[PDB]
Amino acid sequence: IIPWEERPAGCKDVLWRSVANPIIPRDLLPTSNSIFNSAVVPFGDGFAGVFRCDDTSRRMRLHVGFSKDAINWNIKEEPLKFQCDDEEIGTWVYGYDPRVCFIEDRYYVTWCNGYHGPTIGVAYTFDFETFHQLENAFIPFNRNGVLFPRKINGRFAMLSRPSDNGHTPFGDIFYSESPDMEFWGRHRHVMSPAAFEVSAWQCTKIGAGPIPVETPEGWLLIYHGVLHSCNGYVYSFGSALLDLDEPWKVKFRSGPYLLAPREPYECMGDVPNVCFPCAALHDNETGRIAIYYGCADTVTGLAFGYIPEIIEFTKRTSII
Amino acid sequence: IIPWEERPAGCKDVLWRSVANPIIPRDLLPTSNSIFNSAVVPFGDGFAGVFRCDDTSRRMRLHVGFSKDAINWNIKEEPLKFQCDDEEIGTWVYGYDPRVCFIEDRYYVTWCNGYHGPTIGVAYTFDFETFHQLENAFIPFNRNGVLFPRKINGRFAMLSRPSDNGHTPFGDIFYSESPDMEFWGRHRHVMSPAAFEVSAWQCTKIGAGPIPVETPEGWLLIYHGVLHSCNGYVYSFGSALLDLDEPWKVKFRSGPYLLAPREPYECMGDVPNVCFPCAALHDNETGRIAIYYGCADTVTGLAFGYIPEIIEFTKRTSII
Amino acid sequence: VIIPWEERPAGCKDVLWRSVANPIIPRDLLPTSNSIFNSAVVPFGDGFAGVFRCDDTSRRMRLHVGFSKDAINWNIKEEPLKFQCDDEEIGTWVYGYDPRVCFIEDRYYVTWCNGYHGPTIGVAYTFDFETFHQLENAFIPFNRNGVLFPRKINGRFAMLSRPSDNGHTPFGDIFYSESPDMEFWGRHRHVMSPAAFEVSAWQCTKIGAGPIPVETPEGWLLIYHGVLHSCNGYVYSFGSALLDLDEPWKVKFRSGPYLLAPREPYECMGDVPNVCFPCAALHDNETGRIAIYYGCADTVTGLAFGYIPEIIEFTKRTSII
Amino acid sequence: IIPWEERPAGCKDVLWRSVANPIIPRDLLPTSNSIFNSAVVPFGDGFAGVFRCDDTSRRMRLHVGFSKDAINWNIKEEPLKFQCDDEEIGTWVYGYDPRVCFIEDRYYVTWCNGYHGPTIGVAYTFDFETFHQLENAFIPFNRNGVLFPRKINGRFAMLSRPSDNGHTPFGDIFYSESPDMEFWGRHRHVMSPAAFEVSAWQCTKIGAGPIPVETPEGWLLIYHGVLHSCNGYVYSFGSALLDLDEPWKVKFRSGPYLLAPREPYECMGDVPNVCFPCAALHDNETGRIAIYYGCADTVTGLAFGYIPEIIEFTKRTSII
Amino acid sequence: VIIPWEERPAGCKDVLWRSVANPIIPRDLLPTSNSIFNSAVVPFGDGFAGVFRCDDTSRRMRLHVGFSKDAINWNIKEEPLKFQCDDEEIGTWVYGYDPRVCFIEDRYYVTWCNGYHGPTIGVAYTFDFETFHQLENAFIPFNRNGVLFPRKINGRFAMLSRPSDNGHTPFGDIFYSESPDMEFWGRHRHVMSPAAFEVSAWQCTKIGAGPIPVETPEGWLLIYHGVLHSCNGYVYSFGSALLDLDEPWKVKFRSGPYLLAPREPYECMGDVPNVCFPCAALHDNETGRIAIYYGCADTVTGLAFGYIPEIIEFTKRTSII
Amino acid sequence: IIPWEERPAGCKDVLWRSVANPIIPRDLLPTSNSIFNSAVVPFGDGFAGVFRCDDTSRRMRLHVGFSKDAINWNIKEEPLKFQCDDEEIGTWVYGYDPRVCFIEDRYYVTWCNGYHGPTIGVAYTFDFETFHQLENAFIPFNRNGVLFPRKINGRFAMLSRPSDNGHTPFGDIFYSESPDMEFWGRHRHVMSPAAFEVSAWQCTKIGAGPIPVETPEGWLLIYHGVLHSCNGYVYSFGSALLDLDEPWKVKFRSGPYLLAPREPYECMGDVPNVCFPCAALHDNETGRIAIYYGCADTVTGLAFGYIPEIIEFTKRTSII
Ligand SMILES: OC[C@H]1O[C@@H](O)[C@@H](O)[C@@H](O)[C@@H]1O
Ligand SMILES: OC[C@H]1O[C@@H](O)[C@@H](O)[C@@H](O)[C@@H]1O
Ligand SMILES: OC[C@H]1O[C@@H](O)[C@@H](O)[C@@H](O)[C@@H]1O
Ligand SMILES: OC[C@H]1O[C@@H](O)[C@@H](O)[C@@H](O)[C@@H]1O
Ligand SMILES: OC[C@H]1O[C@@H](O)[C@@H](O)[C@@H](O)[C@@H]1O
Ligand SMILES: OC[C@H]1O[C@@H](O)[C@@H](O)[C@@H](O)[C@@H]1O
Ligand SMILES: [K+]
Ligand SMILES: [K+]
Ligand SMILES: [K+]
Ligand SMILES: [K+]
Ligand SMILES: [K+]
Ligand SMILES: [K+]
Ligand SMILES: [K+]
Ligand SMILES: [K+]
């Protein structure tokens, strides 16, 4: 059962923040500087996750966490290490902004992995104890790698985001497929930043956030968008619907954002003015969805909504 | 009858913030994201204005507002539409940072209007219901267009600010005239940013704020200045006195600011560290002035003072 | 008026062809000249007169008057041109470059990029190419490539321009504006933007008006520069468009290919490598002949020739609109 | 019958330019502006090629060409058009810097193909008349795609060069494999630019040139390297030797360049100071190699050398 | 000398901990102060003295003298300090910031970032914190974060510095220099460079010396700032290194983690958000107590406490050397 | 007996190029790529020098050379290596743009030496065979270090040029003194680039060139000046007169240049459009001076003039 808070009285918004935010504090571990941009899945009779925890050396590491209620997290103090037979791909340099999902027979994790620059690291686990590392999916520079939670016409599929070797000032979302979780291709453009005249919260760069959520009306994609002000970037997040069978085809895309930096814990911290969605839990029976997002690259927050309402919002406000 | 709060006990500042700031919140309209950098005038038995209201799509629109007390505003939910006979000029792309004044027999509105980049839009109204759009006054790129509240020597006059098509890293204030509100010329440089050693709150770029205020000795100009820190622009504002007959001739210019970002509503929000004045109401019989400014490009605040004290300060601290 | 002319080289299939005598003006024509380029030329009396940008050996930018019988061999004054002006503020000289000159109604007008707290369009007139009278700068900075039309358009003066910045400007759209009186300007309209690089990359970074627009029955023939940005800098090429006669901000045709791009050593090596920058043209409607003057590598001046009807047919055939 | 000119008397250089350079002029086609970055192979009883011919609109197109002697070229006037079933991949935006080799049963051509940015296009031909387009091999941004001329341990292999969407100011050579010329993976870093103190001609970026040349001692790689002066980039080229079985492992890499911009045809043109090798023809019986290279992004030149000499030079001056 | 102290909180495991009275110096202490931060403090007489960077409401950077009986409650002079100088050129005031003060042998020395055709390191001395005598600037521009050693090193004065540029410097190594006479400087040695980001990203963009080096039996304890560059700006944190006693350009240990990083509202909001910038320390070798003063968000001044032997241990335990 | 070529009849220029330019070809040594920006002095019966020779690896090294006439040089094939008692200072990273003069008892060499960036390296020699390295004079970043040829008031004196660690976009000339060739100080600003309205060949940055030349009226300084065009830097050179006793005080400074890039060997090369003066030889009896300058960072050229004509030109065209 997914975490949930009823929409506040009078609240007109499609998504609403948890009154318990932030749900994960920056100093949960003895050496944590910040814990954000993290992944969460159901597992056993509770929840598991892979967490981005930057330490007091400002190094970026991944940590496994477990939770009974998906809100109060027990995160391992020791960083996760990946088992790999190839010594060269097995070399840890850094890692951030994990996404996790179950595909058919095991859990997969993707992350931004350092291999002569940022690329997409891939690994699996059957038990959230031992993680086995596969080949990096792409050549650098790439980030915001997010798998589909089932095969698409019999292939693995992943969204990604060609980037550069710095604070990237552009970003289109792409789609790729693999028959075997080793060799990737059939690359297709999914979408580009909107024109600032039309939707400026998503006009500098975009990236996939949580694992795509299957609905009868398409893949529900929650994605971040950036606006470039004189004083930096503002990360907000919104919704689109992708075709079921060819998910590089965008059928609707929201004009307004779903969420943008408003609260003190979103506006002040290591990187101000950031809401960055990394994971969602949902229940199709009740339509409920709970969206985890990094706040100011410092802590982790939750927000709630109803899938049918998010669909309706995406279509009614669509800029395509 | 202008809004007013007495100088706080033992306040030695020439301007003091309203203890009720912000006076206009970001969410006054159903889809407003922010409401800031806005224009206000007396109208009838009360007040009217044109407001920059950025929506939840981060689109920039102008909305008409009305108020009985100049503090609590009733802002029309629908964006303002301009009437124009010329189809090319009457095409709306975006609009921001409006200024409004009465000149002779009607109200005039300038704003930053998109026409193949930022330039200065012009329109007039008699009633804040129908707005007749006139020719854009200049070729792009130009912003911070602010009309004088009477003709100067039989011509209309306007301050402007040549710019570029990004977050402009420079900016001098200029002055121009028009016999007819159609053709503009006799362009004169008013002032450049100060040297950083002399006055750094105004060393990167400057721009006119509220409508110039006539005094016996010249025009009181309240204007924004930017300081470029390692972590962004800080917008503060200050005062100058221009020659009455030839307003490009600056007589005094404040070394110190009048106001700079200090409170959490000025320091945190969509664009941190911004105090951007765009309107003032004044009463020559009492010397009272009330200055409306954008706060963090998020909300609108008010600050109060006396014109003769501001003039005395501007002279006594003059950097010229 | 006998305009300079060389017949198309045998075998040559280009719309324009360079003079075999290029460069026609060398960099060291005056005792202190560093470079002479980006200049203006008109018929005057039984020969030709012009206003020339001559940068000196201090690399200051100045305008000099010149006269020629044949429009090829120029006698340029050693001393810079000075403008008369009753307004001291406007009449203050900081610098000036890239002049254009045309006759409108009753006198010659000069526009140039004039320094007034940055680049703007300076404006003057002369009756005799001896005394020059300065008028208001037409626009607020930053603006350059101000080019007048050679008659009024529906009862108003008209000028092309090009909003810029205070550096090596990395953008540039051509605009059109009007004036009833050569003092106040307005009714600004956008003419064109750089093309997409996948469509026409010689003109994808920025563009600007060159020579005075040439009136044809088919519209105004605009000869204009375009910039391509390589890893090693800007390349300036030039090409042709056709503007509506009555509303010259409406572009009717615009060439895909350039007309001329830097090729010769005098275009590719010099103070600013890889520049062909058209500044003036002489034409003869009787014969269709046109002779186009252009700055070469910001160092010397060259001439190219073509036929107006061929230029027009090329612009149409290859139009990217 | 590969083209050849013997070392000049006295000449101590490992490579020497053809006395006939440039061997392809800029104006060979009726609307060619330049012909420079071009791929040549033995075909039938002569030679065939795909040529980058930028036109007088400065569009980048590829053209097929044929020659008896590999020197005097007859290049088709109309650009090459690819057959493709898939309309999305099949859409032409631009194309440059082709490379061509025979693999097993057909000729393959790669090039820098526009697909929402630069990536590596792939195609094949049996006859150099009709070309059939395959999937782009990678997600943007990537350039300098160069196939190996046989499979490596039963997979197709390709060198590439992760880039950005501008004049890329960085660049490592990578190595990737495919079982089927559709799905790519097992990406491995081959080499980075050198330290400027060590070898400044190759210290900004590098990229593969001609098709790797199999020697008993490994793959001979001819590659470009960039130096950044105050007035622009200078492209020179040099040699390395890659392990035969695992060609991302570099065995030797030359300190000095083989060739750098010196002649007027290399130092004056559309892009000054460029020698950009693009193809080679060689003879294992004689040890001779003829290297085709772009000059100033304007014309095509040829240089000659001996493979074992190049190898010994690569070893003796190795910076690894 | 009784230095300020607060005992570490119940179960706080950190090596340094903030004063519960932070900020100890507010932004509006003086009638025209905009901010007061990045300041220098020392024992003097039977209390304490300092030189404070107080930026005014014109955002000019000036230095003011202050005094305190307890080093927490400060009386800062309203009027900026003025230096007396033999040489009128060197004695010309343009601006000054980021003061450091220490006693060397027989007097107090002040260094600051002094404007002389760009930022450099000004030097002056005082016996009384009333009259200051300015000496030659120690280096040619561009340089800042000049910090003297509190005694001579093998008979010469010694200074850490930080070569810079004329803007928001995006790089920075700490250097070490010597002088026999407080006039001529030389024997320059590189001390350390920013860390690789994969190793220690709080100090990967640039570094600079903070308080005056603190002599320990295990080396000079250097407390220094590091910058990390995020998409939205620079974050300044600070940490610790140990330098060889005899040759202080040789770094023996260097911390992986920071000691302190912007966390509280007064460090994360203000004129420059996300800055903790250490400027001075007071210490007592008998108790091992150290009190470190640091600018917060370039707006106010804060204090943090620790123990010298715990910092030494932290530095060695986490060393990235 | 210094080299000399009479000013051509009719020639009105203050300096004129040797008709034998370039006097040093880029390929004089077996591994040289370029030879420019080099230092020359009288020695014994002829002349000696220290030459910047960049090799075919594009490494920057100094080499010693000798000549009978100062025109035809025999340059040692192997780079100059310094003796140094301190291993930290004695470590060679790179070196360029040497200057050489005799002071009191020996020859001193300054160059731009890499020590955690560019700074001014110092060495002496009695014989041009053995060179003894001294302390680097300054902390990085600094270049264009040029000694005075005698003590000034009992101290060694040096011009320098504060810089950054790239292609430096600014540059003022400074003056410093030393009692002992070990500790430096008394730093004084000499001059800054001119405003571009006034003298644009020297508006971006300047730096000192050859060793200053003592005259009755002051030190004659020949110095380079940069203009920044849209396509790069142009290096020209000119002249100033400094006070004899306090050489940071500038008495006269030329408006026009003396020499600017004009010939193919100045305008085409590794770095186009560079004339970079590094040395001079002069004869007070005749007023003859011969100036050595680098040409396009490729080859070395010579130019001639008369000291009294240079002095009169400098005073007559002075911008001070
Ligand atoms: O700093 C803001 C953001 O920057 C980008 O690099 C992301 O991929 C996130 O990891 C982060 O939240
Ligand atoms: O973002 C801060 C400021 O930016 C500029 O573009 C202004 O003209 C304002 O609209 C604004 O307040
Ligand atoms: O330098 C190249 C070109 O630069 C621009 O500024 C033009 O307006 C011309 O003056 C010049 O030819
Ligand atoms: O402009 C010079 C070079 O630029 C790069 O983009 C290369 O890939 C080449 O196409 C070209 O030769
Ligand atoms: O603004 C952050 C920091 O910037 C640099 O210039 C420092 O030397 C400090 O003055 C300041 O705290
Ligand atoms: O490249 C042009 C010039 O660049 C600078 O770094 C100089 O100090 C010279 O070495 C050189 O001639
Ligand atoms: K799509
Ligand atoms: K003025
Ligand atoms: K906003
Ligand atoms: K148009
Ligand atoms: K490798
Ligand atoms: K080309
Ligand atoms: K060290
Ligand atoms: K001076």
- Kindly state the tokens that stand for F174: 């400074």
Question: Is the separation of the CB atoms in B113 and B119 below 8 Å?
Answer: yes
Question: Is the separation of the CB atoms in E150 and E110 below 8 Å?
Answer: no
Q: Is the CB of F166 inside 8 Å of chain D's CB atoms?
A: no
Total number of domains in chain B = 1
Question: Is the separation of the CB atoms in D113 and D137 below 8 Å?
Answer: no
Q: Is the CB of D227 inside 8 Å of chain F's CB atoms?
A: yes
Elucidation technique: X-ray
Q: Do C261 and D33 touch (CB under 8 A)?
A: yes
SS3 A126: coil
Tell me the backbone φ, ψ of residue A311, rounded to 5 degrees. -60, -50
Residues of chain A contacting E273 with CB distance shorter than 8 Å: 268, 272
Beta bridge partners of F313: none
Sign (positive or negative) of CA dihedral E81, E87, E92, E95: negative
Distance CA F276, CA F98 (A): 12
Distance CA D4, CA F213 (A): 56
Q: Which of D230, D231, D233 to mutate to test the pocket of ligand 6 (most atoms within 8 A of CB)?
A: D230
Burial class (CB in 10 A: 0-12, 13-18, 19+), B214: middle
Question: Is the separation of the CB atoms in A174 and A184 below 8 Å?
Answer: no
C-beta atoms surrounding F291 within 10 Å: 27
Sign (positive or negative) of CA dihedral C129, C130, C134, C137: positive
Q: Is the CB of A144 inside 8 Å of chain D's CB atoms?
A: no
Enumerate residues 6+ apart whose C-beta is below 8 A from D250: D190, D191, D240, D241, D242, D243, D320
Q: Do F115 and E190 touch (CB under 8 A)?
A: yes
Q: Do F199 and C168 touch (CB under 8 A)?
A: no
- Kindly state the tokens that stand for C173: 């759209």
Burial class (CB in 10 A: 0-12, 13-18, 19+), F251: middle
Q: How far is the CA of A249 from the centre of ligand 7 (A)?
A: 4
Q: Is B268 annotated as a binding residue?
A: no
Question: Is the separation of the CB atoms in D235 and D261 below 8 Å?
Answer: yes
Question: Is the separation of the CB atoms in A206 and A226 below 8 Å?
Answer: yes
Distance CA F200, CA C298 (A): 15
Beta bridge partners of B302: B292
Q: Do E138 and F185 touch (CB under 8 A)?
A: yes
Q: Is the CB of E34 inside 8 Å of chain B's CB atoms?
A: yes
* Pairs from B18-22 (Cβ < 8 Å, separation ≥ 24): B18/B301, B18/B302, B18/B303, B18/B304, B20/B71, B20/B302, B21/B263, B21/B265, B21/B295, B21/B299, B21/B301, B21/B302, B22/B265, B22/B295, B22/B299, B22/B300, B22/B301
> Within a 13 Å sphere around the CA of E181, how many CA atoms are in the beta-carbon half?
11
Enumerate residues 6+ apart whose C-beta is below 8 A from C245: C215, C219, C220
Cis peptide before B141 (omega within 30 of 0): yes
Cα C222 from chain centre: 10
Q: Which of E36, E98, E121 to mutate to test the pocket of ligand 5 (most atoms within 8 A of CB)?
A: E98
- Kindly state the tokens that stand for A118: 């940022």
SS3 F201: helix
Q: Do B270 and A229 touch (CB under 8 A)?
A: yes
Q: How far is the CA of A194 from the centre of ligand 7 (A)?
A: 13
Distance CA A137, CA F119 (A): 45
Q: Do E115 and B197 touch (CB under 8 A)?
A: yes
Ligand 1 pocket by C-beta < 6 Å: which residues?
A: A 37, 96-97, 143, 271, 274, 276, 294, 297; E 230-231
> Which atom of ligand 2 has the smallest separation from the CA of B207?
8
Nearest to C175 by CA among C154, C195, C145: C145
Task: Give Cα separations from E58 to A95, B237, B313, E63, F89 (angstroms).
Answer: 45, 11, 13, 14, 45
Tell me the backbone φ, ψ of residue E89, rounded to 5 degrees. -60, -55
Nearest to F80 by CA among F61, F107, F101, F103: F61
Question: Is the separation of the CB atoms in A104 and A151 below 8 Å?
Answer: yes
Mutate to test the interface with A, among E198, E202, E203, E231 (most CBs of A within 10 A): E231
Residues of chain B contacting A257 with CB distance shorter than 8 Å: 56-58
Nearest to C52 by CA among C62, C44, C42, C108: C62
Q: Which of B297, B298, B299 to mutate to test the pocket of ligand 2 (most atoms within 8 A of CB)?
A: B297
Tell me the backbone φ, ψ of residue F307, rounded to 5 degrees. -45, -45
> Within a 13 Å sphere around the CA of E59, how many CA atoms are in the beta-carbon half?
29
DSSP letter string, A251-303: EEEBSS-SB-S-SHHHHSSSSSSBEEEEEEEEETTTTEEEEEEEETTTEEEEE
Largest CA distance in chain B: 57
Question: Is the separation of the CB atoms in C309 and C244 below 8 Å?
Answer: no
Q: How far is the CA of E183 from the centre of ligand 14 (A)?
A: 20
Residue A93 to chain E, least CA–CA distance (Å): 7
Nearest to C164 by CA among C221, C200, C205: C205
- Kindly state the tokens that stand for A154: 């019999």
Residue C244 to chain B, least CA–CA distance (Å): 16
C-beta atoms surrounding C257 within 10 Å: 24
> Within a 13 Å sphere around the CA of D85, how many CA atoms are in the beta-carbon half?
2
User: How is residue F48 annotated by DSSP?
Assistant: E
Distance CA A74, CA A65 (A): 5
Q: Is the CB of E289 inside 8 Å of chain F's CB atoms?
A: no
Element (DSSP H or E) covering residue C177: strand C174-179
The structure tokens 């594009």 sit at F58
Distance CA E116, CA E146 (A): 15
Task: Give Cα separations from D286 to D68, D239, D259, D309 (angstroms).
Answer: 20, 19, 22, 12
Helix intervals (H) in chain A: 264-267, 307-316
Helix intervals (H) in chain E: 265-268, 308-317
Which A residues 232-271 touch E at CB under 8 Å? 232-233, 268-271
The structure tokens 């996300």 sit at E274
Q: Cα E50–E53–E57 angle (5° rounding)?
A: 135
By residue count, chain C amounts to 321
Which E residues 185-204 touch B at CB under 8 Å? none
Residue C21 to chain D, least CA–CA distance (Å): 21
Distance CA B18, CA B168 (A): 31
The structure tokens 């027999």 sit at B105
First to last CA, chain B: 35
Q: Residue D35 is part of which domain span? A: 1-320
Neighbours of chain C (3+ CB pairs under 8 A): B, D, F
Task: Give Cα separations from A58 to C186, E28, E229, E235 (angstroms).
Answer: 56, 34, 11, 11
Q: Is the CB of C274 inside 8 Å of chain D's CB atoms?
A: yes
Q: Is B191 annotated as a binding residue?
A: no
Residues of chain E contacting A55 with CB distance shorter than 8 Å: 257
Nearest to A173 by CA among A164, A163, A182: A163
Burial class (CB in 10 A: 0-12, 13-18, 19+), F125: buried
Nearest to D211 by CA among D102, D66, D104: D102
Q: How far is the CA of B203 from the centre of ligand 8 (A)?
A: 16
Beta bridge partners of A304: A16, A290
Question: Is the separation of the CB atoms in F201 and C59 below 8 Å?
Answer: yes
Enumerate residues 6+ apart whose C-beta is below 8 A from D86: none
Q: Which of C27, C35, C36, C38 to mutate to test the pocket of ligand 3 (most atoms within 8 A of CB)?
A: C38
DSSP 3-state helix, strand, coil percentages of chain A (rounded to 5)?
A: 5, 50, 45
Q: Do E273 and A268 touch (CB under 8 A)?
A: yes
Distance CA C201, CA C195 (A): 7
The CATH number assigned to the domain holding B178 equals 2.115.10.20
Identify which ligand lies nearest to the alpha carbon of C250.
10
Ligand 2 pocket by C-beta < 6 Å: which residues?
A: A 229-230; B 37, 96-97, 143, 271, 274, 276, 294, 297
Question: Is the separation of the CB atoms in C305 and C238 below 8 Å?
Answer: no
Q: How far is the CA of E265 from the centre of ligand 1 (A)?
A: 22
Nearest to B237 by CA among B271, B210, B268: B210
DSSP letter string, E226-266: EEEEETTEEEEEEEEEEE-SSSTTSEEEE-SS-SB---SHH
C-beta atoms surrounding F83 within 10 Å: 11
SS3 C149: coil
Question: Is the separation of the CB atoms in D13 and D5 below 8 Å?
Answer: no
Q: Do D269 and C268 touch (CB under 8 A)?
A: yes
Resolution (A): 1.9
Cα-based torsion angle of the residue sequence B243, B249, B254, B260 in order, rounded to the nearest 10 degrees:
100
The structure tokens 């990217």 sit at C320
Distance CA D238, CA E210 (A): 47
Burial class (CB in 10 A: 0-12, 13-18, 19+), F74: exposed
Distance CA C137, CA A107 (A): 70
Burial class (CB in 10 A: 0-12, 13-18, 19+), E235: buried
Q: Is E188 annotated as a binding residue?
A: no
